[PDB]
């Protein structure tokens, strides 16, 4: 049901930016422009876009048709502002750099979308804002990670909790789990700023997916992040977790592609018993997050947010 | 006016300031150097024709219409503004002729509207505002595309260089946030509509695809500092050439060989494109003069005939 009708909204909103005669647009141009839509928006399998729309439903308690078509027109934009973000990381991640105008393009279809479809309503420049304050945070989370790579290039020094946390944060959890509940609530009348204990549990809940991959990696049926000189949270938690020869060992095989160091990485891993810690980190963590989901007066938005926190659960 | 004109260049200390301990953002100390640093680069550098035009425009469009110090603070935070998007797409302008340019100019982007934000949201016209920079880099980077498009990847069938196709190039990627824009501050920062403003608007833009035009010719005839572009020289030779001549340029456009580039430059100035950049240079004017007095706000007039002055000749 949401599943075909929200797809169609694609070519609804498609179709309006393309003939949005505000540019002048060829044929050829027109084309251009439909290519570089088609190929990044509506691929993937749609995780938060479609979360956009469920988060509504599951707030609501009876949905109109229009209720509906807006919603999704909301998950659709954060569709598009999530390609925008996700060409700029190919990019940044190893005869066209129109890879970047490309980008560029799809970020300033958000608030062509936004404003064709929420200005009248009283909540618009709160979307504004809320795509804004996202996208802000993003690109800032895009340059800690530029910094803290390049300057992690052999000096593993820089790799410290705070940072991995404040780039987990900002580049990723905003946008993944932020955005779309906030979508949500935004077009429920809600208003953002008396729900910063649902903010600050859904970007914990951002941070804690990263951990997961972080560990994913390493161990489980493959993952690259120790030849990458990634910064994990595992090397993180070995760095300050590790004596003085292990500091070391971690100094002479990190970064390094070649089986033998890798395995080097890996045992002093196992050694230092990071599976547990990361099963001890798993545990807390849901029960911080449950504990405090609770805590909010709203029941609906514990729903939401306990949908969210069961389904990245031991992922 | 280098009396005021030392104000304006302080709201750049303070904005970054600002901008660098939003602690809503999270930087360590390290992150804060390394905005900070992107941003001295590219922003505050240059003349700041534009973001002093922001001011200038709203003094001329007050002078005629006591102004007060946060008046004017505000007016050089729009011109500042205007400083970041222009930095932002002169990055954007350098990465299109290690890959950290592509986030500097980002950051510079979204710098735009946290400015915009904290010192205009409380305003009437904030959404006015919001949509005016929405509107100029929208037409800038579909500027960009058209760019793309056309230049380097329609290349040596250059039948594909027309008057239409390099006038929109120049008025989307250029004119809007050159010329466009720093007016349009003024007049939202005035209370006014830019709706009811078209006839301005389309004035500007013109002048800004007049302003592209000079560079042009500047280019194949002058000094300064410093083929296969989308030159008006070259446009105007297209439509103005016989046969054989359009074999000519066929033949020798596009070539890195001064022969052949010294047939471009002599079919030019056996075309008289020298006193044809002369004429268009007058009839543009007079053309722009012209439709500038039509309007009927005066104050407006007077500000647009400080910029087609200002541009003339040079």
């Given at each position: 049901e949401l599943k075909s009708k929200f797809v169609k909204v694609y070519s609804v909103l498609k179709k309006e930016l393309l003939h949005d005669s505000?540019?002048?647009?060829?044929?050829?141009?027109?084309?251009?422009?439909?290519?570089?839509?088609?190929?990044?928006?509506?691929?993937?399998?749609?995780?938060?876009?479609?979360?956009?729309?469920?988060?509504?439903?599951?707030?609501?308690?009876?949905?109109?048709?229009?209720?509906?078509?807006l919603a999704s027109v909301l998950g659709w934009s954060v569709e598009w502002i999530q390609a925008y973000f996700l060409v700029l990381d190919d990019i940044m991640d190893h005869v066209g750099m129109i890879a970047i105008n490309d980008g560029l393009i799809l970020r300033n279809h958000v608030p062509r979308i936004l404003r064709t479809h929420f200005q009248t309503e009283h909540y618009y420049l709160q979307l504004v804002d809320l795509f804004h304050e996202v996208e802000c945070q993003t690109i800032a989370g895009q340059m800690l990670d530029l910094i803290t790579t390049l300057a992690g290039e052999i000096n593993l020094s820089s790799y410290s909790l705070?940072?991995?946390?404040?780039?987990?944060?900002?580049?990723?959890?905003?946008?993944?789990?932020?955005?779309?509940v906030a979508c949500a609530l935004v077009m429920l009348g809600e208003n953002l700023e008396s729900h910063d204990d649902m903010k600050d549990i859904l970007l914990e809940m951002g941070t804690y997916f990263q951990v997961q991959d972080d560990y994913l990696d390493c161990f489980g049926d493959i993952g690259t992040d120790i030849e990458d000189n990634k910064c994990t949270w595992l090397v993180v938690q070995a760095l300050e977790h590790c004596?003085?020869?292990?500091?070391?060992?971690?100094?002479?095989?990190?970064?390094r592609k070649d089986p033998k160091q890798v395995a080097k990485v890996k045992e002093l891993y196992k050694t230092?018993?990071?599976?547990?810690?990361?099963?001890?980190?798993?545990?807390?963590?849901?029960?911080?997050?449950?504990?405090?989901?609770?805590?909010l007066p709203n029941v609906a938005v514990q729903a939401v947010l306990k949908s969210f926190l069961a389904k990245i659960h031991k992922r």
């Amino acid at each position: 049901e949401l599943k075909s009708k929200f797809v169609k909204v694609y070519s609804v909103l498609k179709k309006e930016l393309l003939h949005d005669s505000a540019f002048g647009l060829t044929d050829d141009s027109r084309n251009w422009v439909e290519r570089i839509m088609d190929y990044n928006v509506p691929g993937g399998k749609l995780n938060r876009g479609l979360s956009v729309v469920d988060s509504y439903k599951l707030l609501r308690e009876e949905l109109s048709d229009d209720e509906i078509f807006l919603a999704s027109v909301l998950g659709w934009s954060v569709e598009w502002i999530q390609a925008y973000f996700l060409v700029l990381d190919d990019i940044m991640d190893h005869v066209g750099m129109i890879a970047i105008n490309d980008g560029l393009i799809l970020r300033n279809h958000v608030p062509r979308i936004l404003r064709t479809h929420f200005q009248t309503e009283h909540y618009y420049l709160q979307l504004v804002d809320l795509f804004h304050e996202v996208e802000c945070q993003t690109i800032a989370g895009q340059m800690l990670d530029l910094i803290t790579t390049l300057a992690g290039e052999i000096n593993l020094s820089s790799y410290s909790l705070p940072v991995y946390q404040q780039i987990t944060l900002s580049k990723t959890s905003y946008y993944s789990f932020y955005l779309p509940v906030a979508c949500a609530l935004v077009m429920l009348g809600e208003n953002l700023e008396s729900h910063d204990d649902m903010k600050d549990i859904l970007l914990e809940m951002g941070t804690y997916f990263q951990v997961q991959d972080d560990y994913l990696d390493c161990f489980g049926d493959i993952g690259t992040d120790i030849e990458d000189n990634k910064c994990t949270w595992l090397v993180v938690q070995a760095l300050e977790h590790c004596n003085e020869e292990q500091k070391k060992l971690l100094y002479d095989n990190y970064g390094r592609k070649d089986p033998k160091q890798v395995a080097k990485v890996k045992e002093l891993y196992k050694t230092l018993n990071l599976e547990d810690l990361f099963t001890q980190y798993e545990n807390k963590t849901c029960k911080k997050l449950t504990k405090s989901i609770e805590a909010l007066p709203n029941v609906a938005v514990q729903a939401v947010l306990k949908s969210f926190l069961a389904k990245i659960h031991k992922r």
